[PDB]
Design a protein around this ligand. Structure first.
Ligand code: UBK
Length: 127
């Protein structure tokens, strides 16, 4: 399924090239531009542990998730990953714990040393 496909064909978008964040473009977005650090970004997402458990989505309550990019407002993988996305793009990310919740986890939902999977849709971004 979707996580396995990321392993096989995802691009390693980390600076250290440690496969900590792997990305596939599932739906191409519009234009050329991708958000800059400091931009306000609007997304929909679905997340889970890579094994399929602990599913959560912003579409549950059909309300976009908004954050400023590169301002420590989300896990590192999202600051890295969303920065690469075009408006209208849907991406899949597979994330090792070093780029997510690490050894601490986010208990009880997210265990220590958890690998995560996300589907993210970049709806819009603004200066
Ligand atoms: C700079 O580092 C951090 C900055 C902020 C946080 C707080 C958690 C933060 O959530 C996230 O960063 C990620 C990506 C954005 C969407 C929510 N996140 C999730 O991991 C998902 C997951 C879904 C499935 C498995 S994990 N969390 C949720 O969907 C739920 C469980 C609903 N919780 C929240 O969304 C809580 O609301 C938040 C609001 C802002 C930032 C974060 C969470 C943790 C950070 O590092 C550990």
């Amino acid at each position: 399924g979707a996580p396995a496909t990321v392993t096989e064909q995802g691009e390693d978008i980390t600076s250290k090239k440690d496969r900590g964040v792997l990305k596939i473009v599932k739906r191409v977005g519009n234009g050329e531009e991708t958000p800059m650090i400091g931009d306000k970004v609007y997304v929909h997402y679905k997340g889970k542990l890579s094994n399929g458990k602990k599913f959560d989505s912003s579409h549950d309550r059909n309300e976009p998730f908004v954050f400023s990019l590169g301002k420590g407002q989300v896990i590192k993988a999202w600051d890295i990953g969303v920065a690469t996305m075009k408006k209208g793009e849907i991406a899949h990310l597979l994330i090792k714990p070093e780029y997510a919740y690490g050894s601490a986890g986010s208990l009880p939902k997210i265990p220590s040393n958890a690998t995560l999977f996300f589907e993210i849709e970049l709806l819009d971004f603004k200066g």
